[PDB]
Amino acid sequence: VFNDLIGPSSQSLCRFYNGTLNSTTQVECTYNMLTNMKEMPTYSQYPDLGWSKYWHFRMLWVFFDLLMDCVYLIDTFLNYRMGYMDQGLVVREAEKVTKAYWQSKQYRIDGISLIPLDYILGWPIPYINWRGLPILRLNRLIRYKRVRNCLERTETRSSMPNAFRVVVVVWYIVIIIHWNACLYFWISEWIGLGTDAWVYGHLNKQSLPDDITDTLLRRYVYSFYWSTLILTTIGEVPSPVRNIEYAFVTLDLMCGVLIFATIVGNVGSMISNMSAAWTEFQNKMDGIKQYMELR
Amino acid sequence: VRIRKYLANYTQDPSTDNFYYWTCVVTVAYIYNLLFVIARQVFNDLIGPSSQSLCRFYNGTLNSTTQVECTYNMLTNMKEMPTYSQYPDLGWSKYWHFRMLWVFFDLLMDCVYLIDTFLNYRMGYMDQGLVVREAEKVTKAYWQSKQYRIDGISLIPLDYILGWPIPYINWRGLPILRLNRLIRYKRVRNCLERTETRSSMPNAFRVVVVVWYIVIIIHWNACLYFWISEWIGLGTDAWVYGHLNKQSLPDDITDTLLRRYVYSFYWSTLILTTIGEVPSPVRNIEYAFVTLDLMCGVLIFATIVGNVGSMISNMSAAWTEFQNKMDGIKQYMELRKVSKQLEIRVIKWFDYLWTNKQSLSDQQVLKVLPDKLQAEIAMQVHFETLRKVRIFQDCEAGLLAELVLKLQLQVFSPGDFICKKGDIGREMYIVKRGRLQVVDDDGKKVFVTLQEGSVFGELSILNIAGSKNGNRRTANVRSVGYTDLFVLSKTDLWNALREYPDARKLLLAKGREILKK
Amino acid sequence: NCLERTETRSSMPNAFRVVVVVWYIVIIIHWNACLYFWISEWIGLGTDAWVYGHLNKQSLPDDITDTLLRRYVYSFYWSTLILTTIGEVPSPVRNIEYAFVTLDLMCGVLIFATIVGNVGSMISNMSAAWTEFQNKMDGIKQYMELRKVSKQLEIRVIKWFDYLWTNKQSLSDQQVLKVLPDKLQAEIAMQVHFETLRKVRIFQDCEAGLLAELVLKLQLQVFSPGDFICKKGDIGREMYIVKRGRLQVVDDDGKKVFVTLQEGSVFGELSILNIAGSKNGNRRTANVRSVGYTD
């Protein structure tokens, strides 16, 4: 969604009226031209799609992508040699664990989660004029079983279990609000920024107020605030204009009602359970104090 | 004549699966009525508009302000709402295809209601645990049960007469006269109950049903808001839908039927969830409606999200009860200063107990189910261990049923001893899953390896004084890895073998054979 | 005392509980409406934009008359939006209005949290028996899924549960045997079971306190239409009385009926008696098979 994270690959061209030239020309946007603008900047692509300036950011992202795919490959090798529990004991002979690997159909879950489409079609190629699809690395999210086993085997073994439960539901909250932030800015890019007053842009006037620059940090910070106000159903955001914005805000508010109702219900139960022994002691003392009062 | 002699003695069995799929068909027809009768009453352009919108227009070529029919650029950014003038045929010359589509679906769901009335007329009531399938008894029990009034109010065809735009009477149609089809709610409630008892994904069906309840409630409040916005008059004040609302029709937004339903659905979503980011009311009847609607939204959405929070709390209830047991044991071993190796042995036992998760789930089956079905469950699960056990292959069959209802599971650690040389024998063991080893007292050298299905510990609980150990165990027994054991006690086996003397003579003779071996 | 002695004696208790908390809601919002208009009169109407008056512009908009009905209707709407903490009212201006709105919003948070908690509990309790039945069915369906029980036993168990919810007169004796005294439990056991106590051959000829002491110790077992109650070689530990259902005695393998034991018929009383003159003793004399469902 926020495709300026790898470098912008398209220079912003604001319309500008220099008084010395006495002409209204399109030049590249500085930070004073993104502050208090009358229209959104038009983007024109670089001929190399930004690779001559932002190769250090792109090789940082490529290095972390290769590091987590090597972590996925070593996890696939440990899946290939995993000792299954047969009769209460693990099996440590190689032919039995590879045969029980190939019979259990774990290799399809390990194989869909390692298709390297992201190294081919996930980066800005200038020769094809391919802008890159980073969403083709969504196949790495199919390995959720190892994460669920790590969270289960952490909170059975942890000496502070309620602190880990609170940290895990806070991480669930931040990941849900982040995915709704990228969903809001994908719809705000798809409709067109600055076209109406619900979409991010210059017409929103909560997104870009007086003396506020339009940067990538402003885009993520306003989209995170919009999803925080929508998913907690405070709703102090601009009301929708077009019908597809009404459909998205209605679906997002009902999803926010349902899943934040269950999430805060879990947080209220988890902080009710941090002093459950004191409350059960207090119910026994309330019963005995009421009995000795009435008799 | 074949369908006449078939229908002369047809009687429906309500317990069958074909009747349950018929209740799904009646649920589909009921959901059609429950949405589209109030959508057709309020949003009456769903059947064709039957009144052309006449916007006031100033053409600069004519230099005159005339009333012409509204195009989509004249409903976009308007200064006043369009006045409606009726067609002479009430739109039947243009919108007969939409009206015959609605007439065809209305006739299809009324034929579904008629076939459901015929199955009500021939429904087999349960008399003595059996259904009745003779025709005179089920029609007499139909006419005595007063089901015919509920079936008869729900089939009055007022909608085919006064529910459509008739041009000769200049009758604009009352689609709300098809609200009598909503009295058949018992078949829908039986379909939802008999679906979520029989479904293998019950919590997904519960979540889908409360999402459908949410959408039907917000849709009925959407049609209620647009009925009050039509009744007050659209565009007359800033709470009502119209041009003065400025959230309903902003800059460059056309006023269509989709805009009316989409804004009314958004208004009821913000009112019933009590976010309230809608225009504040102006007239007093709008204040009364918004106050009543907000209090109804507080109450029924509080109970609905309470149900959704309980239903997604119950999707992981076993993990939370396991975590309360682990929290109690971890708090106990923290405060009593238990050493580290017993604590890692206990949490490794709990990691094993959640990893296999086929250990201890017998409690609700032993609570609510009858003993014949509990015995049949004990046959069908445990059959691979009941087929190998040396006493269980040679007994009376009711004796092995009475013994297999009294077994229990004990999970054992890989270092744990099951018996030592000098423990008193009070339990007989059957290895359900796991590997066992007999060893020396201090030498620790194996003699035999007791595999799965092997039975031991039955002579150490027998009371024959010819065996010199008596109640003492004959050998050291150590589990190799983790071990589930079918554990038969001394007392329950001695009761069941007291009730059967001939198998007691057989096991006593096997005691003589193991004494002379 | 009138509300307590109404909802103990009412045949619709949950409807009375819902009507009483709706009356509590309306009386609380009415008293906060009169509290808001007393402070709006005391400060002075139309002096600022939080107070009722002409400067409020939600209270008196364009073409809205200031009447007594407008005063009560706007004050009731203001307290409905404050006590439910929607808060779409004008923000306060003077400091005493800030103190009143802060105190009123915190009172609204606390007492409407407990009131809607009571309403959520009261409409959760209107279908508590169906949810407890569904927890038992969820446990049994999860157990038969994980143990790989075959399909015909699973459809027999869910058909038994469909019958157990369809008649719903099977097992509801637990709270009566808990809290009620044994004289009233005995009188309930007389008044319900009288059509089966009038036919039973031991129960027509005994001492009356003996039949009371026996009828407190009975129990219900529901039987499937294929199920056998006794076979030829089971040890007799139970005496049966057919409360509702049809029974049949059959051969060992020939499966031909001899008599049809109807409702009210008593059997299984000689097989538990310890007289050695009967050659079977504890063994059952005949095969007994239920025809349909059988209590």
How close C209 gets to chain B, by Cα (Å)?
A: 30
Nearest to B227 by CA among B283, B286, B179: B286
Q: Is A278 on the interface with B (CB under 8 A)?
A: no
Strand bridging mode B83-86 / B64-69: unpaired
Q: Name chain A contacts of B347, Cβ cutoff 8 Å.
A: 156-157
* Probe site for chain B from C116, C122, C237 (most B CB atoms < 10 A): C116
- Contact, B315 vs A265, CB < 8 A? no
Chains touching chain A through at least 3 C-beta pairs below 8 angstroms are B
* Long-range pairs of C277-283 with CB within 8 A, sequence gap ≥ 24: C282/B499, C282/C235, C282/C236, C282/C237, C283/C232, C283/C233, C283/C234, C283/C235, C283/C236
Nearest to B494 by CA among B464, B455, B456, B454: B464
3-state DSSP assignment of residue C159: helix
CA separation for the pair A68, B475 (Å, rounded): 54
A236 annotated as belonging to a binding site for a ligand: yes
Nearest to B111 by CA among B160, B144, B146, B149: B160
Those residues whose C-beta lies under 8 Å from the C-beta of residue C25, and which sit 6 or more positions away, are B295, C115
- Contact, B44 vs B91, CB < 8 A? no
B245 token code pair: 């609302």
CA separation for the pair B44, B50 (Å, rounded): 9
CA separation for the pair A61, B263 (Å, rounded): 43
C196 token code pair: 């089966």
A54 token code pair: 């932002």
Can you give the three-state secondary structure of B230-243, one letter per residue? HHHCCCCCCCCCCC
Q: Is the dihedral of CA C141, C143, C147, C150 positive or negative?
A: negative
* Probe site for chain A from B308, B344, B384, B409 (most A CB atoms < 10 A): B308
Element housing B455 (H / E): strand B455-456
The minimal CB distance from B347 to the residues A156, A246, A273 is found for: A156
CA separation for the pair B197, C135 (Å, rounded): 11
Residue B90, Ramachandran bin (φ over 0: left; ψ between -120 and 50: alpha; else beta): left
CA separation for the pair A137, A123 (Å, rounded): 11
Nearest to B19 by CA among B109, B116, B107: B116
CA separation for the pair B509, C8 (Å, rounded): 67
Single-letter code of the amino acid located at B475: A
Q: Is the dihedral of CA B67, B71, B73, B78 positive or negative?
A: positive
Nearest to A120 by CA among A62, A77, A178, A163: A62
- Contact, B290 vs B277, CB < 8 A? no
Place of tokens 């030049």: A27
3-state DSSP assignment of residue C267: strand
Those residues whose C-beta lies under 8 Å from the C-beta of residue A97, and which sit 6 or more positions away, are A80, A81, A82, A83, A84, A91
Polymer length of chain A: 295
Those residues whose C-beta lies under 8 Å from the C-beta of residue A110, and which sit 6 or more positions away, are A76, A79, A143
Chains touching chain B through at least 3 C-beta pairs below 8 angstroms are A, C
Q: Name chain A contacts of B269, Cβ cutoff 8 Å.
A: 250, 253-254
CA separation for the pair B354, B323 (Å, rounded): 10
Single-letter code of the amino acid located at A262: T
C46 annotated as belonging to a binding site for a ligand: no
- Contact, B223 vs B41, CB < 8 A? yes
B193 token code pair: 């109950």
B68 token code pair: 């012409």
The rounded radius of gyration (Å) of the Cα atoms in chain C is 33
Q: Is C169 on the interface with B (CB under 8 A)?
A: no
3-state DSSP assignment of residue B443: coil
Which residues 75-104 in chain B show a CB within 8 A of chain C? none
Which residues 101-160 in chain B show a CB within 8 A of chain C? 126, 128-130
Those residues whose C-beta lies under 8 Å from the C-beta of residue B57, and which sit 6 or more positions away, are B65, B66, B67, B68, B74
Strand bridging mode A10-18 / A23-28: antiparallel
Those residues whose C-beta lies under 8 Å from the C-beta of residue B203, and which sit 6 or more positions away, are B311, B312, B314, B315, C138
CA separation for the pair B98, A247 (Å, rounded): 25
Single-letter code of the amino acid located at B178: R
Q: Is B285 on the interface with C (CB under 8 A)?
A: no
Using alpha carbons only, what angle is made at residue A35 by residues A31 and A41, rounded to the nearest 5 degrees? Answer: 80
CA separation for the pair A34, A31 (Å, rounded): 5
Using alpha carbons only, what angle is made at residue C76 by residues C73 and C81, rounded to the nearest 5 degrees? Answer: 125
Contact between chains at B262 and A239 (C-beta distance less than 8 A): no
Nearest to B426 by CA among B461, B468, B391: B461
Q: Is the dihedral of CA B122, B127, B133, B135 positive or negative?
A: negative
CA distances from B446 to B427, B454, B476, B479, B482 (A): 23, 16, 10, 12, 18
CA separation for the pair C80, C36 (Å, rounded): 11
- Contact, A1 vs A189, CB < 8 A? yes
Q: What residues are paired with A13 via a beta bridge?
A: A28, A42
- Contact, A29 vs A215, CB < 8 A? no
DSSP assignment of B473-490, as one string?
A: -SSEEEESS-EEEEEEEH
Per-residue DSSP letter, B158 = -
CA distances from A257 to A185, B205, B268 (A): 21, 19, 14
Single-letter code of the amino acid located at C29: I
* Probe site for chain A from B72, B305, B316, B346 (most A CB atoms < 10 A): B305
Element housing B119 (H / E): helix B96-121
Nearest to B161 by CA among B143, B173, B149, B147: B173
- Contact, B429 vs B389, CB < 8 A? no
Q: Name chain A contacts of B350, Cβ cutoff 8 Å.
A: 156
Resolution as reported, in Å: 3.1
CA separation for the pair B5, B132 (Å, rounded): 19
CA separation for the pair A209, A35 (Å, rounded): 9
B387 token code pair: 């087929």
**Within 10 Å of residue C70's Cβ, how many Cβ atoms?**
17
Q: Name chain B contacts of A236, Cβ cutoff 8 Å.
A: 277
Using alpha carbons only, what angle is made at residue C28 by residues C26 and C34, rounded to the nearest 5 degrees? Answer: 100
Contact between chains at B310 and C124 (C-beta distance less than 8 A): yes
CA separation for the pair A166, A159 (Å, rounded): 14
Q: Name chain C contacts of B284, Cβ cutoff 8 Å.
A: 69-70, 73
Which residues 233-272 in chain B show a CB within 8 A of chain C? 237-238
Distance of CA B273 to the CA centre of its chain: 24
CA separation for the pair B133, B10 (Å, rounded): 8
Per-residue DSSP letter, C91 = P
Residue B309, Ramachandran bin (φ over 0: left; ψ between -120 and 50: alpha; else beta): alpha
- Contact, B482 vs B414, CB < 8 A? yes
Nearest to A57 by CA among A111, A6, A21: A6
- Contact, C197 vs C190, CB < 8 A? yes
Using alpha carbons only, what angle is made at residue A64 by residues A60 and A70, rounded to the nearest 5 degrees? Answer: 145
Q: Name chain A contacts of B253, Cβ cutoff 8 Å.
A: 241-242
C123 token code pair: 């409409």
> Is A7 exposed, middle or buried, given 0-12, 13-18 or 19+ CB atoms closer than 10 A?
buried
* Phi/psi at B409 (5° precision): -105, 135
Per-residue DSSP letter, B166 = B
C269 annotated as belonging to a binding site for a ligand: yes
DSSP assignment of B42-107, as one string?
A: HSTTBTB-SEEEEEEEEETTTTEEEEEE--TTTSSS-SSPPEEEE-SSTTTTTSHHHHHHHHHHHH
> Which alpha helices (DSSP H) does C84-150 contain, by range?
95-124, 128-146
By what method was this entry solved?
A: cryo-EM
CA separation for the pair A260, A254 (Å, rounded): 10
- Contact, C289 vs C250, CB < 8 A? yes
Contact between chains at C153 and B377 (C-beta distance less than 8 A): yes
Strands of the A42-45 sheet, one edge to the other: A23-28, A10-18, A42-45
Can you give the three-state secondary structure of chain A, one letter per residue? CCCCECECCEEEEEEEEECCCCEEEEEECCCCCCCCCCCCCEEEECCCCCCCCCHHHHHHHHHHHHHHHHHHHHHHHHHHCCCCECCCCECCCHHHHHHHHHHCCCHHHHHHCCCCCHHHHCCCECCCCECCCHHHHHHHHHCCHHHHHHHHHHHCCCCCHHHHHHHHHHHHHHHHHHHHHHHHHHHHHHHCCCCCCCCCCCCCCCCCCCCCCCCHHHHHHHHHHHHHHHHCCCCCCCCCCCHHHHHHHHHHHHHHHHHHHHHHHHHHHHHHHHHHHHHHHHHHHHHHHHHHHHC
- Contact, A42 vs A13, CB < 8 A? yes
CA distances from A128 to A1, A53, A120, B468 (A): 21, 19, 12, 91
> Is B18 exposed, middle or buried, given 0-12, 13-18 or 19+ CB atoms closer than 10 A?
exposed
Q: What residues are paired with A5 via a beta bridge?
A: A7
B337 annotated as belonging to a binding site for a ligand: no
Those residues whose C-beta lies under 8 Å from the C-beta of residue B284, and which sit 6 or more positions away, are C69, C70, C73
* Long-range pairs of C255-263 with CB within 8 A, sequence gap ≥ 24: C258/C286, C260/C291, C261/C288, C263/B128, C263/C196
Q: Name chain A contacts of B434, Cβ cutoff 8 Å.
A: 87-88
Contact between chains at A156 and B266 (C-beta distance less than 8 A): no
Q: Name chain C contacts of B198, Cβ cutoff 8 Å.
A: 158, 162
* Phi/psi at C285 (5° precision): -80, -25
3-state DSSP assignment of residue B191: helix
DSSP assignment of B350-390, as one string?
A: HHHHHHH--SS--HHHHHHS-HHHHHHHHHHHSHHHHTT-T
Contact between chains at B197 and C161 (C-beta distance less than 8 A): yes
CA separation for the pair C148, C139 (Å, rounded): 14
Contact between chains at B273 and A233 (C-beta distance less than 8 A): yes
Q: What residues are paired with B430 via a beta bridge?
A: B455, B486
* Phi/psi at B314 (5° precision): -85, -5
Q: Which residues of B429-441 are buried (b: 16+ CB within 10 A; e: fewer)?
A: bbbbbbbbbbeee
Q: Name chain A contacts of B252, Cβ cutoff 8 Å.
A: 196
Element housing B345 (H / E): helix B340-356
Nearest to B137 by CA among B150, B149, B127: B127
- Contact, C43 vs C51, CB < 8 A? yes
CA distances from A194 to A85, A204, A207, B8, B70 (A): 59, 7, 10, 71, 29
- Contact, B147 vs B215, CB < 8 A? no
Contact between chains at A88 and B214 (C-beta distance less than 8 A): no
C242 token code pair: 């057919």
* Phi/psi at A130 (5° precision): -100, 125
